[PDB]
């Protein structure tokens, strides 16, 4: 059942309701899901790394990031695995922290 | 045991100090009946510390690499689902992963 409302849940963040390349990459990858062959977190990896729209901010502060990070350790199950994924494309495609804090927070309230 | 000496001809295990040591400790659960051969993978390669690594991988490629997987035999798919986990959470290159996905199903 949880494993539904995993994907209940992401299907209601707002980055991928405004994402059709992340609704469009979660029809190809749940399969695989569904198939045990990869596990959520690995979902939310694939899926958030066909995001094509999101803010840009290029050589963010280490301070902000750190505190976002000590942040996470804190955070529910859903919620970690969201932010996690989601800052994989803060370091490597320069998504904006301010823009990933928001997402978490929906995240944790989903869940 | 067919599974366990398929894995100790694995180039990726055998360059992996860390994994033959592991397998060394983990083995005679297995032997035991305390843990199964998936969870011996599992065990054996996280403890791996050598491979290539790429952050930000392709969407694409991967989806291409999971739908072989998906068509793969017995060990060879228990030996690239628990690589894979690799792939995504430590960054191990796809390409690297479909290398040893090959000398898998060589070995099977």
Not at 3 to 28: G, H, M, R
């Amino acid at each position: 059942d949880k494993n539904d409302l995993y994907i209940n849940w992401l299907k209601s963040l707002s980055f991928f309701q405004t994402n059709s390349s992340c609704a469009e990459a979660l029809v190809k990858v749940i399969p695989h899901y569904h198939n045990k062959l990869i596990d959520f977190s690995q979902v939310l990896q694939l899926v958030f790394s066909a995001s094509e729209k999101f803010p840009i901010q290029e050589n963010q502060p280490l301070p902000e990031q750190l505190m976002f990070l000590s942040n996470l350790e804190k955070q529910t199950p859903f919620a970690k695995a969201v932010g996690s994924s989601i800052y994989k494309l803060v370091t490597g495609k320069n998504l904006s922290l301010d823009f990933a804090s928001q997402i978490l927070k929906e995240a944790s309230i989903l869940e």
